[PDB]
Amino acid sequence: HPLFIDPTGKKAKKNVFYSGEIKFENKVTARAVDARLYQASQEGQKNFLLEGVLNALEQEDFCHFEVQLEVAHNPIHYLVGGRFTHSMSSLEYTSYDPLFFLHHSNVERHFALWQALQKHRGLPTRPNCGLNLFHSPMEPFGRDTNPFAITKDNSKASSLFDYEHLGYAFDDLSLNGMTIEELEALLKQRRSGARAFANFRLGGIKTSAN
Amino acid sequence: NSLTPSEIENLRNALAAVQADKTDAGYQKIASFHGMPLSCQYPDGTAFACCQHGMVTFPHWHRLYMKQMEDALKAKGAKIGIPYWDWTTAFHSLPILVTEPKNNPFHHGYIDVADTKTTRDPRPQSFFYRQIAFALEQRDFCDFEIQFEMGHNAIHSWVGGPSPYGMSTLHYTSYDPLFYVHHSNTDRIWAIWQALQKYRGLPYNSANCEINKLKKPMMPFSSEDNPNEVTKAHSTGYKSFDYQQLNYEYDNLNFHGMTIPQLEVHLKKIQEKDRVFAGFLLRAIGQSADVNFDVTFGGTFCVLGGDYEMPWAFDRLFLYDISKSLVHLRLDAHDDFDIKVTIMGIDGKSLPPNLLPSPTILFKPG
Amino acid sequence: RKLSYNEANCALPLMNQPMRPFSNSTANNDRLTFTNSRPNDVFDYQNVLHYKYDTLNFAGLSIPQLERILQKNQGRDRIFAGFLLHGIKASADVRIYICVPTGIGEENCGNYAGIFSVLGGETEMPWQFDRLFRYEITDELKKLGLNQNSHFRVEMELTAVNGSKITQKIFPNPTIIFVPSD
Amino acid sequence: YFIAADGTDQKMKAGEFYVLGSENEMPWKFDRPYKSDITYVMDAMKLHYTDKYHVELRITDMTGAEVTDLKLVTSVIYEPGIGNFGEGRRWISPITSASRIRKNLLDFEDGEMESLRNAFKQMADEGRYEEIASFHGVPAQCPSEDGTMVHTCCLHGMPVFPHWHRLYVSLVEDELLARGSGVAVPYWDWVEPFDELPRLINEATFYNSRT
Amino acid sequence: VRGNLVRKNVDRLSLQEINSLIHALKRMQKDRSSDGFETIASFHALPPLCPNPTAKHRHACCLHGMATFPQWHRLYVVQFEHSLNRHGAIVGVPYWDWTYPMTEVPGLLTSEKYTDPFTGIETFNPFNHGHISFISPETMTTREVSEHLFEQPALGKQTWLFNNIILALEQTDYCDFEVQFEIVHNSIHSWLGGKELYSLNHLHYAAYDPAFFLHHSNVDRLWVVWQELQKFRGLPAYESNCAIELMSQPLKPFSFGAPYNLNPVTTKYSKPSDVFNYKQNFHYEYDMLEMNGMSIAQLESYIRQERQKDRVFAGFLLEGFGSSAYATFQVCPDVGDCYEGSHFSVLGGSTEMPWAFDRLYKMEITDILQAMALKFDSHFTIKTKIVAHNGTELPESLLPEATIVRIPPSAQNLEVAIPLNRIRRNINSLESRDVQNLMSALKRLKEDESDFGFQTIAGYHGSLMCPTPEAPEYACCLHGMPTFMHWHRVYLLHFEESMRRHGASVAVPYWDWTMPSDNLPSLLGDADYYDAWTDSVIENPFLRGHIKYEDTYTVREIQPELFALAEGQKESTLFKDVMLMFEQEDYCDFEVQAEVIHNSIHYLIGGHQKYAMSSLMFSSFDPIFYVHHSMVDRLWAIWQELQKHRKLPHDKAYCALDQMAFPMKPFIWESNPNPTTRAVSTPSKLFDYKSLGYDYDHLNFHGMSIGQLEALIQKQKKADRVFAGFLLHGIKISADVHLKICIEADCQEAGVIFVLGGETEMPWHFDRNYKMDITDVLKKRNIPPEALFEHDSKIRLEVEIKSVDGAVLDPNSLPKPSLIYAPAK
Amino acid sequence: VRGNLVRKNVDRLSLQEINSLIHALKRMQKDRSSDGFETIASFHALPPLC
Ligand SMILES: *[C@@H]1O[C@H](CO)[C@@H](O[C@@H]2O[C@H](CO)[C@@H](O[C@@H]3O[C@H](CO)[C@@H](O)[C@H](O[C@H]4O[C@H](CO)[C@@H](O)[C@H](O)[C@@H]4O)[C@@H]3O)[C@H](O)[C@H]2NC(C)=O)[C@H](O)[C@H]1NC(C)=O
Ligand SMILES: *[C@@H]1O[C@H](CO)[C@@H](O[C@@H]2O[C@H](CO)[C@@H](O)[C@H](O)[C@H]2NC(C)=O)[C@H](O)[C@H]1NC(C)=O
Ligand SMILES: *[C@@H]1O[C@H](CO)[C@@H](O[C@@H]2O[C@H](CO)[C@@H](O)[C@H](O)[C@H]2NC(C)=O)[C@H](O)[C@H]1NC(C)=O
Ligand code: CUO
Ligand code: CUO
Ligand code: CUO
C-alpha cells in the first residue's frame, strides 16, 4: 500500500517502500506485477522461482553457480516490474524501486548459502572465474566521492569474496526450513540419476525478455 | 404460551433423554401402544392395535397414556408437566417447540419399525371453539364423548395429512412428539368438563352410561408387561376418572377467558337461540378419512382409523350445527333442504360414498 | 375491503355544498342538522349524528361472511341489463321483458324478467345519472336456456304510477352487459 | 409550545407542560418522548399533516424572565385511527360516540311500540312533524340560482341522495327522542319477505293500555 | 390469396407507392360509379340514405357517439380501400399517426399540385381537396388548421393527444375505451376542419375531404393497438362484453345487399360483431402497431406506471347536438384566480341521429391541481365554456356541469424496464468491463476541479458548511434522526450523477458485509493496476481519497473484527443485527437499528484514525463511503419491500412530519451543480428509490426471497428474547461502546456498538434506544431470563466507552443500558 | 432473458428515443474506459491493434 499507518492517529505519510521516486527525469516507478509471481495454486504452475535458485545451489563451480544464480534472480525483476518502462523490469530504473534492495538481500542471502554449502564440504568459496575483473575498484564505489569509507576500501571485487567484515549478518540464510545438511541431501540426491537440460547460449540483447 | 425460559429449557433435554431409554420402552415401547407395532391379541392371538378410541372409555386410556408418557420423563428434570396448546384458540401458525428446525427434540420422532422420522403435512372466530363448546354443552358423559373424540381427531386429521408416517394415521401417530402435547389439551378439555359438571351437580368422577365397559380393564395398561405400577392400578375405566390421583394439575381449567361459572353462562347464553344440527352415524372403517358437508358449505369433520384397529360403532349420533348454513341460504328449518356430503380418505383419494348411511337433521330451540 | 368508507373518491364537487333545506336558517332551527348540513359532515353517522344500528350484519351474515358470498357471486358468469335513467316529472314503474327471436320469420317478445321504479314529482329538481343502472337478468336467461352469445333483445315496458297512460320510450334501450367469472 | 406555518405566519398555542427541577436534582433524561396530541389545533389551522409546519416553543422559569434555549421537538407523530382496519390494525368494530340504537322493527316489544306511537302522536298533535315533512315535500323551498323556478328541496338525482335522507331520518329521530321516545327510529327490513305489513304501520287503530 | 394490403405511415410511402396511390384516387374521383369517391362519401352523412334509401325523413348515416362507432368506421375505410385497390393502388389506405407529435401536415395532404416523377407531368394533387357533387361542380372541401395540432412536449408537459390517447388505451372496458377513444379522434376533425363549413369538422361534408380516410386509417390503427393490448392483458380483443345489444344491428348502408352497396365482402360482414377480425375478413395489415414509437409491451408498462400515481379527473357527460362544437373548461379555486384546464371537441351536423353517452368522458386534471397547490378534496370548481362551429357560445344549460373523480393508486409490482447504467449491483458480481468503466470514471471525477468534482461533493458531508455560509458554527450532514437515510440517499444520488457525468455506465455497487468475508473486495482492496491502452500503471481510485484542505489522503486501518463480525455464516452477529432491523414495522424504529449498524462498518474499516471512514468529518472523502452507503440504502429498499409485503406503509412514514416536509440543506442552495438533486431535496420525495430513476439487482437477503425473510422474521418473534437498550447522542467524537454482562464480579463481553462523530458535528439525539439482544449470549452462560427478575443471582451491565483515537478512554457520558424483555406473542 | 434491441429507422425515432440516444452517446463519448467511443472507434482502423 502507498500509505503508511503510524500507530499514532496523526496524518498518513507516503510509505517509503511502495514507490521509489526517480528525481532526475521525473517520477515515478510503479510496478505492473505479472501473474507468474504468485504460485499458491494447488499443484501447478510448479514453483519455478525455487527451482531456479535450487539449480544454482547445486553447481559446484563459481562460474557455473554465477550464471545460474544470475539468471534465477532475473524472474523477480521481470515479473514485478512488468510492461511498465520505469520499473524493476528494466535494469535502467530498477534500483529506484525500494523492493529492489529487499529483493537483493535475498539473492545475496542465496550467495552466502552457496558459499556455506561449498564450505560444508569440501570446495572453494573463491571465485576462480573473473580474476582480471577483481583488481579494479568497482565504480562508483571506488570513486573519490564515496560517502562511506567501508565500501570504498572494499571496492575491489578481490576483497568481496567474504562478507564478515562488511558489518552485517542474516538471521537464517536457510531456504524453506531446510538444514544446511537437509538441503545438501536433496541437492546431492537430485544429482543421482539420468538427467536432461535445456542448453542456452546467452548474452546481452539490450532488453529484458521472457 | 406464558412459558418462561428456562421452563421451556428443561424439557427438550428430558424429551431428548427418553428418545432412547431405550430399555423400558424406552420410548418406542411407550410409542407402540397407540402406534403401529402390535399391542395385543384376540384369544386367537391375532394382532390388534391396542388403541382405545372409538369407545366411551376413550379419555381414560389417553389421559393415562399421557401419564405413561408423562412418567417416562421421570426425574429427568421432568420438572413440569407436558404442556398443552389450546388449539381452540385460533392460530396463524404451529407452535414453536415443535417447529424450530435445529437442535430440537419436538421436531420429529423416529421409528425403528420404519427406519424414519415422522413427516407432517399441515393443511388449511375459531372453528374448534364452536366445535368444542358444543361438547361442553352436553351433560351426559356419553353424549359428551362422541363430540369430545370427534373434536379431537379433527386435529390428527389436519396435523398429519397424507403421510402414512404421521399424525393422520393411527399406525404411527403416537410416534410424533406433537401428539401428547395436543393431548394434554384434549385431556384438559375433559377436565374442564368435569369441573363443569361438578358445578352443575351432575356426576363428574362417575358415569352412568354405560356400566358395561368402564369395567373392562385396559391393555396395554393391563398387561403384565408395563413396568409402571401406577397405570395398572388405574388400568380400569372407573378409576382414571378422578385424575386427581395422578397426580397432576392444570394451570387453570378456564376455557379461554372464562370462569367455569363464566363458561356455563356462556353456553347458557348460546343456548337461547334455537339451533339446528345434523348428526351422523359413524362406525369403524380401516382407513382414516375427513368428511365434507353440504346442503353452501356445511362441512366438516374427521374420523381417525387404521388397519388392524378394533372395530367400533358409536351408540349416539354426532352433532354438527349447520344453522349458519341455513341463514346462508335464508332457510327457516321450514323450507326443506338436501344435506349433501362428501368424505375424503386421508391419502390423496378418494371420497368413497357411505359407508355412512344418511344424516338426520334435527332442530333445537331456543 | 380497505376502501374509503367515511369519504368518497367519487363525484367530489357535490360533497361540500350544504343540503339546501337544512343549510337554510329557516326553517331548519335544529342546530345539529344545520351545522352538519354539508354532505361530508354526515358520512360517519355515529360520531356526528350519535346513533347506531343494533347489528350491521345483513340477512344474519357477519360482514366477513357477507364479502364471502359477494365474492362467490363474482365467481360465476353473469349478465346484466343497463339502464340510463333521468328525471321524469313523475314517478313510474318500468318492467323488464326478454324478447326472443323466433326462427322464421323474425319474431318477439314478452318474457317477464324484472321490475324497478323511478321516483319523481312535477316540480322535482332535474337530474341525469351519469352511469348505467344494472339489473341481473342472468337467472332468467337460464330459464330460457339462453346465453350471452345467443340471440335476444331486452325491452322495457314503462308503466307509470297513474296505473294508466302507460309511458312510451323515455329511456335509451337497455344495454346488455356480460361479466365473465374471475 | 405553538405550531407555526410558513405562510401568514400565524400561530396557535398548542398547550403547555411543566418540567420539575431544582439545583441538586438527580441527573435524568427520558429514553422516550413525552407525547401531547395537538390534533385539534392542527385541524383548526386547516393544516394537513404534510404541509410544512415548524414547531416552536417558548420557555420560562418560575420568575418572569425567559430561558434560552432548547429543545429537540423534531418529531411530530401521526397516529392513525384504530378502527379503519388499515395496514397496522386487524378488523375491529370501532368504538364511537354513539348514543341512540336503532333496532329491527320486528325485534320491537309491546311496550317499545306504544312508546314510539305516543311519542310520535305528540309530535303529530303539535305542528312539528308536518314541518319536517315539508323539508322534503311539495311546498317548494328551493329556488336557485336566479331563480327562475322553485324546486322540492330533497336531492334525488345526486350521488348525495343518501346524505340528504341520512340527515332527514336524523332530524325526525332527534325531535322524536325529545318527545320522550323510549327508542330511536327503528328500521324495518323489507328485504325479508312478508305476507302482511308490520304491526306498527298496518292497522289503523291500536289498543292503548294507559288510557 | 393475393396477400393482405398494408396500411403504411404516410411519410414512409415511396415515390412508386405515392404515385400508384395518386393516379388511383384520380380515377375513383372521376369515377361516377358507386365505386367512386362522391358515392362512398355519400355513405357518410349528408346525402342521407341510412334509415333506408326510400324514407321520407332521413338522418345522417354513420354511427357517432355510440359503442359501435369504431366498427362502422372500420368497415367504412375498407369500403374506400377496396375502391382504390381496384383503381390500381398497390397498397392499402395510408395513415398519418397523431401518436407522434406533429410539426406539419403531411405532404400528400398539403401540397396542392403533384408531379409524377416517372412521367414528369405536373397535375393537381387529388388528396388536397374533394368535390361535393350535388351542391355544384364548383364546390370543394376547404380546411383551416388550428395551432393546437402542432403542440410539442414541454418540460413536464406532454401533447394533448399523447396524454388522451394513452388515457383511452388505458381503459379495460370496451365501452369505456370507445367513449374516450372517439373524442380523442374528434380533435383532428376540429383541428384540420376548423370553422370552415365544408370541412372535416362538419359531420356532413367530412368524408368529402380525402384526408378523412387517411386520418381514420389511423383511427382504425389505434383500435387495433387497443385490440392488441387486450390480447396482451388476457382480455377479449375480438369480442365486446359491453353493448352486446348493439353488436347485432348491422351497419348501414353496408347492410344493403341490393343496388346501394356492390362490395360482396362489405355486405357479408355488415354486422358489427363480424367487423372485429379485420385481417381475415377484410384482408389488411398495418406496418406498425405503435403509439409514438412504443411497442404494445412498452405501452402497457407506461399505462401501469401511470395507474400507480394518485390521479384526479374531470368527468363530462355528453349528450349530442347538431352542430359540432368545442368545449373549454377551467379549474377555479375559491379565490378568484382561474387556471386553464384542457379542452375537447364533438362532431355533429343537423341530420345526425341523436346520441347520448351512458358513461362519463374523463379528462385528467391531476397535473393541473398540483400546479394549483391544492389536493383533490379541496375547494375548487370547474367552469366550462363551449362555443359552436358557428361559432357562438352555447348555453351552460346545454351540457350538464362537469363532475370530478379521484382514482386511488393501485399498489402492485411493475416491470420496470430501467436503463442498464442505472441499476446498482453486488460488487462481487461485476464483470471486468464494469470495473474498468467505474475506475476510469472515478479517476476523472476525483481529478475534477469543478463543483461537479469529488472535492466539492465530499465537502457536503463533513463540513463546516451548513446554513448559512459563512455562519457555521455547524456541520452539514443528517444524523442521527429519521431523515438520516434520506440525506445520504440524495448524497449517493448526487454521487451517481457525477459518475455518469464522466462516463460511468455503472451505478454505484453495493458491498454486502453481512456475508462472511476474509478480506476487503478487490475493487476496493487493490492498490494499483496495469492499463493496457496506456502503458502506464495507475492506482485504484477506490483505494483512497485526498483531503484537499487538510493535505492528507484518507486512511483505512481495518480492525480484524470487521471480518470477524460476520463469520457465522448465518450465526454471524451482523446477520442477527440486520434481521432485528428488518423486523421493525415502524420507520423510526427501523432507522435507529439501521444507522447504528451503519456506524459499525464506518468504524471498523477506518478505525483508530483521524481522516478515515471512522471519523464522521472526513469519511466521505474515502470512496468506499458511497459503496458502503449503497449497501445501507439497499437494506432500506429491502425493508421498504418487506414493508410493502406486509400491509404497512412503504412510500411514506408517520414519523417526524416536521422534517419530512422541509427539504434538506446543502442541496437546496442555488450553488448546486445539478438541478435534479435540488428538485428532490425534500425527504418526502426520495422515499421511493424507483422514482429517483435507479434500482437494485437484486433485492434479497442472503439466499432468501422477501416472503422467506418475513417467515424467518416471524420465527424470531416466536421465541423469547432479551435486549439491551442504548439511548444514544452526539459526543463531539466517534466512539465504540463495549457491553459486558456480569453474572457476578466475573464479566464477559456481551456485545459492541459504535458511534460516529467529529469535532465539527451536527448535534444529534436519538428518538428511542437502539436494541441488541443478548439472549444467545445469556443462553451461553446458562442464565434463563427468569433470573433477570431474580434478586439472586445479581447481574449487571458494565459499559466501557472508548474514543476513536485510543483509548482514551472516556468517562461515561452516555446513558447506561436498559434490560428489555420481549415475550413472544 | 432480456428482450431484443430494435434497430429503428432514424426518422422514425420518437423524442424519448432520440433523447436517450443523445445522452447515451454523450456519456460513451466522454467514457475513457475501453467501452468508450474513442476506444471502440480504434477497432476499425488507425490506432492499430490487429
Ligand atoms: C329558505 O327557506 C325559506 C323559508 O324557509 C324560503 O322562503 C320561502 O320561499 C317560499 C317559495 O316562494 C315562499 O312560498 C310561499 O308559499 C305560499 C304557499 O305555501 C305561496 O302562497 C306563495 O307564493 C305562491 O304563489 C305564487 C303565485 O301567486 C307562486 O309563484 C309561488 O310559487 C307560490 O305557489 C309563496 O311562494 C315562502 O313564503 C318563503 N318563506 C319564508 C319564511 O321566507 C327561502 O326561499 C329559502 N331560501 C333559499 C335560498 O332556498
Ligand atoms: C299520468 O297521465 C298524464 C296524462 O293524462 C301524464 O301527463 C303527461 O305526461 C307527459 C310526460 O309523459 C308530460 O309531457 C305532459 O305534460 C303530461 N300532461 C299532463 C296533463 O299531466 C302524466 O305523465 C301521467 N303521470 C303518471 C305518473 O303516469
Ligand atoms: C348556430 O348553431 C346553433 C346550434 O347549432 C343554432 O341554434 C340551435 O337551433 C336549434 C333549432 O334549429 C335548437 O334546437 C338548438 O337548441 C340551438 N342551439 C343549441 C346549441 O342548442 C344557432 O341558431 C346557430 N346560429 C348561427 C351561428 O347561425
Ligand atoms: O324519498 Cu326523497 O326519500 Cu325516499
Ligand atoms: O368519424 Cu364519422 O367521423 Cu371521423
Ligand atoms: O455518512 Cu453521513 O455518514 Cu455514513
Residue E347 CA to its chain's centroid (Å)? 34
For C172, which residue in chain E has the nearest alpha carbon? E356
Segment holding E114, helix H or strand E: strand E113-115
Look at the block and give the residue holding cell 429507422.
Answer: F9
User: Which residues are CB-contacts of E758 (< 8 A; sequence separation ≥ 6)?
Assistant: E462, E475, E615, E616, E617, E618, E732, E733, E734
- Give me the helices (H) in B19-103, please: 28-32, 58-72
Q: Cβ–Cβ of D74/E658 closer than 8 Å?
A: yes
Three-state helix/strand/coil letters over E28-82: HHHCCCCCCHHHHHHHCCCCCCCCCCCCCCCCCCCCCCCCCHHHHHHHHHHHHHH
Residue E729: which of E770, E697, E785, E691 has the closest Cα? E770
State phi, psi for E770 to the nearest 5 degrees: -60, 140
CB E593 within 8 A of CB E770: yes
- How far apart, in Å, are the Cα atoms of B338 and each of B300, B358, C60? 16, 11, 21
Is residue E684 classed exposed, middle or buried when 0-12, 13-18 and 19+ CB atoms within 10 A define those classes?
A: middle
Q: Are E64 and E237 in contact (CB under 8 A)?
A: no
CA distance D186 to D106: 9
Q: What is the DSSP letter of B340?
A: E
**Does the CA dihedral E356-E359-E365-E367 come out positive or negative?**
negative
DSSP for residue A197 = -
CB proximity list for C68: less than 8 A, separation 6 or greater: none
Q: How far apart are CA E730 and CA E464, in angstroms?
A: 16
Report which DSSP code applies to D95.
Answer: -
Transcribe chain C into DSSP letters.
--S-SSS-SS--TTSSSPPHHHHSTTT---HHHHHT-SGGGGSSHHHHH-EEES---BTTB-HHHHHHHHHHHTTS-EEEEEE--B--SS-EEEEEEEE---SSS------EEEEEEE---TTPPP-B-SS-EEEE-HHHHHHTT--SSS--EEEEEEEETTSSS-----SPPPEEEEE---
Residue with cell 460513451: F28
Q: Which three cell numbers stand for residue F11?
A: 426518422
Q: E552: helix, coil or strand?
A: strand
DSSP string, E606-668: HTT-SSBTTSTTTGGGSTHHHHHHHHHHHHHHHHHHHHHHSSS-SS--SS-HHHHHSPPHHHH
Sheet holding E721-726, edge to edge: E770-773, E721-726, E818-822
How far is Cα E753 from Cα E43, in angstroms, rounded to an integer?
A: 84
Distance CA E215, CA E209 (A): 11
Ligand 2 atom having least distance to the Cα of C120? 27
Residue B49 has what DSSP assignment?
A: B
Distances (CA, A) of B323 to B339, D17, E463: 12, 58, 74
- Give, in degrees to the nearest 5, the angle at Cα B249 between B245 and B254: 130
**Residue D156 near ligand 4, beta carbon < 6 Å:** yes
Strand, helix or coil at E267? helix
Q: Which amino acid does the sequence have at D112?
A: E
Spatial contact of D109 and D186, defined as CB atoms under 8 Å apart: no
Q: Long-range contacts made by residues B269-273, C-beta under 8 angstroms, separation at least 24? A: B270/B133, B270/B137, B271/B137, B272/B366, B273/B366
The residue among E518, E533, E535, E537 with the most chain A CBs within 10 A of its CB, best to mutate, is: E537
**What's the gap in Å between the CA of B69 and the closest CA on chain E?**
26
Pocket test for ligand 6, best of E756, E761, E764, E804 (most atoms within 8 A of CB): E756
Q: What is the rounded CA–CA span in Å between residue E458 and residue E445?
A: 11
- Asked if E461 and E477 touch (Cβ cutoff 8 Å), the reply is yes
Distances in Å between the Cα of B65 and the Cα atoms of B15, B25, B127, B247, E564 are 16, 14, 27, 14, 50
Instruction: Return d(Cα B115, Cα B106) in angstroms, integer.
Output: 18
Q: Which ligand is nearest to the CA of E614?
A: 6
Residues in chain B followed by a break, C to N above 2.5 angstroms: 124, 295
Distance of alpha carbon B81 from alpha carbon B247, whole angstroms = 10
Q: What separation, in Å, do the N-terminal and C-terminal C-alpha atoms of chain F show?
A: 33
b/e E543-553 (16+ beta carbons within 10 angstroms → b): bbbebeeeebb
What is the 8-class DSSP label of residue E721?
E
Q: Which three cell numbers stand for residue E216?
A: 381514420
Question: In this structure, are strands C112-118 and C92-99 parallel, antiparallel, or unpaired?
Answer: antiparallel
Rounded CA separation A8/E712 (Å): 45
Within 8 A by CB and 6+ apart from E179, the residues are: E357, E359, E361
Are the C-beta atoms of residues E229 and E25 closer than 8 Å to each other? no
Rounded to whole angstroms, how far apart are CA atoms B262 and B255? 9
3-state secondary structure of E501: helix
DSSP E305: H
Greatest Cα pair distance, chain A, in angstroms, is: 63
- Give the residue before each break in chain D, using a C-to-N cut-off of over 2.5 angstroms; say none if it is continuous: none
Q: Is D138 in the pocket of ligand 4 (CB under 6 A)?
A: no
Tally the residues of chain D.
211
∠ Cα B65 B69 B73 (to 5°)? 155
E611 chain-A contacts, CB cut-off 8 A: 11-12
Name which of E623, E709, E674, E682 is nearest E441 in CA terms: E623
Q: CA–CA separation, E524 vs E562, rounded Å? A: 15
- Ligand 6 atom closest to the Cα of residue E598 is 4
Task: Tell me which chain F residues have a C-beta less than 8 angstroms from the C-beta of E441.
Answer: 31-33
Cell of E132: 361535393
Breaks (C-N over 2.5 A) in chain E follow: none
Instruction: Identify the burial level of E117 via C-beta atoms within 10 angstroms of its C-beta, where 0-12 means exposed, 13-18 middle and 19 or more buried.
Output: exposed
Cβ neighbors of E402 (< 8 A, separation 6 or more) are C13, E314, E315, E316, E329, E382, E384
CA-closest candidate to residue E313, choices B365, C9, B54: C9
* C-alpha separations of E288 from B47, E68, E73, E280 in Å: 79, 24, 20, 18
CA–CA gap between residue B15 and residue E288 (Å, rounded): 72
E165 near E290, Cβ under 8 Å? no
The 3-state DSSP class for residue E116 equals coil
- Residue A199 to residue B2: CA distance in whole angstroms: 86
Looking at residue C29, its amino acid is: N
Dihedral angle over CA of B320, B324, B325, B327, nearest 10: 150
Neighbours of E709 (CB within 10 A): 22
Q: Which chains touch D (3 or more CB pairs under 8 A)?
A: C, E
List the one residue out of C138, C133, C142 whose CA is nearest residue C174: C133
Q: Is E629 in the pocket of ligand 6 (CB under 6 A)?
A: yes
Cα separation, D152 vs D129, whole angstroms: 17
First to last CA, chain B: 37
Residue pair A142/A155 in contact by the 8 Å Cβ criterion: yes
The experimental resolution of this structure, in angstroms, equals: 3.0
DSSP output for E273-286: TTTS-HHHHS-EEE
Q: Who's near C106: CB < 8 A, 6+ residues apart? A: none
User: Which amino acid, C149?
Assistant: N
Name the CA radius of gyration of chain E, rounded. Answer: 35
Neighbour-count burial for E204-232, b at 16+ CB within 10 Å, e otherwise? bbbbbbbbbbbbbbbbbbbbbbbbbbbee
**Distance between CA atoms of residues C129 and C121, nearest Å:** 17
Distance E203 CA to ligand 5 centre (A): 7
User: Which chain C residues are within 8 Å of B327, Cβ to Cβ?
Assistant: 59-61
| Cα torsion E115, E118, E121, E126: sign | negative
φ, ψ dihedrals at C157, nearest 5°: -115, 110
Residue with cell 389545533: D41
Q: Cell digits for A191? A: 544429482
Q: How far is CA E275 from CA B241, E224, E268, E299, E411, in A?
A: 82, 12, 10, 25, 37
| Pairing between β-strand D11-13 and β-strand B340-345 as defined by DSSP bridges | unpaired
Task: Decide: E563 and E519 in contact? Cβ < 8 Å.
Answer: yes
Angle between helices B58-72 and B141-160 (to 10 degrees): 50
Does the distance separating the beta carbons of E786 and B4 come in below 8 Å?
A: yes
Does E62 contact ligand 5 (Cβ within 6 A)? yes
Closest CA to A14 of A32, A31, A28, A34: A28
Q: How many CB atoms lie within 10 A of CB E587?
A: 23
Give the Cα separation of C151 and E199 in Å (integer): 40
E318: which DSSP letter?
Answer: -
Residue type, A201: R
Ligand nearest to the CA of D155: 4
E605: left (phi over 0), alpha (psi -120 to 50) or beta: alpha
Q: How far apart are CA E584 and CA E788, in angstroms?
A: 25
